[PDB]
Structure 1
Amino acid sequence: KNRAFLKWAGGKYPLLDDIKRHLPKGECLVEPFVGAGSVFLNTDFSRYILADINSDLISLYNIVKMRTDEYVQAARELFVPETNCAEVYYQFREEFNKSQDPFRRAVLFLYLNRYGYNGLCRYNLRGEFNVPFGRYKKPYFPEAELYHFAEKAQNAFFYCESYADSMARADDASVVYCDPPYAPLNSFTLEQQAHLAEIAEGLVERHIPVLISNHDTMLTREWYQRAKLHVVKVDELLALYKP
């Protein structure tokens, strides 16, 4: 179980076995919600398309892919112990919210993922990153995970796009793995939630497989109704669209 350099909080690695049980083989895996990368990091496709709306994430990812050593070194500096108090965190939050340089921002992004309350990633209405200090014991610099991610990223393209656009890049050689924000028990709406399904139906008819993960509820069974459904242990659901 290769870990992700980022917290989500990470988040977790349940389901992983089950996702791989039902994930069908192919050349290229297309992920319209990469998030922390956990599935990508734990699979062996020849080739990966990975997308997400959060541009801070994609930008980090391309940098880790293209400038690995220079990235690791600049990031490492600010895991020294002088930077582990409320006074520094807030100064670094502000710098990040005011920076226009993508590189510097990716370095600071890392530190905030690791020193901030529960590894949350959150913006206020002015679109500033607005998570407070976590008061963490001893954070951990993820040097190995960084390198491991960048080796793997050499067969990965990353795009800042929403699900319909990333989903439109699959072809017959592709498989598609979907991890939308969870159905309920701004944000991602139910209209979008049902829209993802239709896209899935559109793709499977074109002979491209699609697997979707979500809570098990009334709404999701409605949405995923034209798919093979496996329940797993609230319960999770894995909707498979096999041609």
Structure 2
Amino acid sequence: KNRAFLKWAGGKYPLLDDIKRHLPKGECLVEPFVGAGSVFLNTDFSRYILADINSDLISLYNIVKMRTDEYVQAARELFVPETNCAEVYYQFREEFNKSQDPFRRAVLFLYLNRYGYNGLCRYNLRGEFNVPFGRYKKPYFPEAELYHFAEKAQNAFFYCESYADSMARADDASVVYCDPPYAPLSFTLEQQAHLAEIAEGLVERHIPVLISNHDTMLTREWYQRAKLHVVKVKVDELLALYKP
């Protein structure tokens, strides 16, 4: 059970067990929607292509991979409890939105993930990071998980681009896994259907794919050519396998 250094108070590491059963095997894993990394951190492919639209995330991750120690040392400073209050939370948020420094930004970013309302990552229309304070007991600085990430990252490349572009990188030796933002009970319905159409194209070329989403009509409509598996846990959750 390997933890992500970033919180997703989605709390979405239970699926992992069913994800791993259903996920085929291969040399490379492409993740067009990497987010916090849990699939990557709990699998053993020999390489990884890891992609996301969020350039803060990708920048952060290149920095953890290539500037490990300087980063880890710099970031821990920010976990002393002088910083566990609103006034300095709001102080850091502003610095972040003002900053032009990739490194300092990555550093503060981890703070806002951890002291932030629900570990949410959101932006306003103006592009400013938008989430408020979370008033959590005492946040844990994820030192161990940082080093794990960085070690495992030596077999990964990270890109900042949209699912369609990362999905074109896949090859006969690849396997794609997709965790798009969830279906209804910003990421449009036409994009959700475009993702399935791209997955259909990749089986025709012998490249396996597996997608996660909620269980709904919409979801079953888009994934109609996949083997479906329903997963229990708070409505159910679907996993759509496209196998050759």
Q: Deviating runs (4+, > 2 A) in structure 1?
A: none
Q: Secondary structure at the match of 2:176?
A: strand
Q: Distance in 2 between matches of 1:142 and 1:89?
A: 18
Structure-2 residue corresponding to 1:146: 146
Q: Secondary structure at the match of 2:122?
A: coil
Q: Secondary structure at the match of 2:92?
A: helix
After superposition, what is the alpha-carbon deviation per residue over 1:58-77, rounded to whole angstroms, capped at 9, x for unaligned? 00000000000000000000
After superposition, what is the alpha-carbon deviation per residue over 1:152-203, rounded to whole angstroms, capped at 9, x for unaligned? 0000000000000000000000000000011111x10000000000000001
Q: Distance in 2 between matches of 1:11 and 1:57?
A: 19
Q: Secondary structure at the match of 2:157?
A: strand
Q: Secondary structure at the match of 2:180?
A: coil
Q: Distance in 1 between matches of 2:147 and 2:5?
A: 9
Sort the Cα spacing of 1:73 and 1:65 in 2 relative to 1 into closer, same or farther, 3 A: same
Q: Distance in 1 between matches of 2:114 and 2:64?
A: 16
After superposition, what is the alpha-carbon deviation per residue over 1:197-227, rounded to whole angstroms, capped at 9, x for unaligned? 0000001000100000111110111100011
**Structure 2 residue ranges without an equivalent (≥5):** none
Q: Distance in 2 between matches of 1:226 and 1:139?
A: 44
**Range that drifts further, 31-40 or 10-19:** 10-19
After superposition, what is the alpha-carbon deviation per residue over 1:34-53, rounded to whole angstroms, capped at 9, x for unaligned? 01000000000000000000
Matching of residues 124-203 of structure 1 within 5 Å:
124-185=124-185, 187-203=186-202
CA contact (8 A) 1:4 1:10 kept: no
**Range that drifts further, 42-51 or 84-93:** 84-93
Give the alignment's Cα RMSD to 1 decimal: 0.9
TM-score by length of 1: 0.98
Q: Distance in 1 between matches of 2:208 and 2:37?
A: 20
CA contact (8 A) 1:27 1:45 kept: yes
Q: Distance in 2 between matches of 1:92 and 1:182?
A: 30
Q: Distance in 2 between matches of 1:13 and 1:238?
A: 14
1:82: how far off? 1.1
1:10: how far off? 5.3
For these two proteins, the number of residue pairs brought into alignment is 242
Q: Secondary structure at the match of 2:38?
A: coil
**Range that drifts further, 104-113 or 11-20:** 11-20
**Range that drifts further, 82-91 or 156-165:** 82-91
CA contact (8 A) 1:64 1:150 kept: yes
Q: Distance in 1 between matches of 2:9 and 2:31?
A: 19
Q: Distance in 2 between matches of 1:184 and 1:83?
A: 37
1:130: how far off? 1.1
Q: Distance in 2 between matches of 1:121 and 1:107?
A: 15
1:12: how far off? 1.5
**Range that drifts further, 232-241 or 189-198:** 232-241
**Structure 1 residue ranges without an equivalent (≥5):** none
CA contact (8 A) 1:176 1:210 kept: yes
1:11: how far off? 2.0
After superposition, what is the alpha-carbon deviation per residue over 1:79-111, rounded to whole angstroms, capped at 9, x for unaligned? 111111111111100000000000000000001
CA contact (8 A) 1:175 1:208 kept: yes
CA contact (8 A) 1:58 1:160 kept: yes
Q: Distance in 2 between matches of 1:51 and 1:17?
A: 22
After superposition, what is the alpha-carbon deviation per residue over 1:102-138, rounded to whole angstroms, capped at 9, x for unaligned? 0000000001100011111011110100111111211
Q: Distance in 1 between matches of 2:10 and 2:77?
A: 23
Q: Distance in 1 between matches of 2:11 and 2:47?
A: 25
CA contact (8 A) 1:213 1:236 kept: yes
Q: Distance in 2 between matches of 1:117 and 1:41?
A: 24
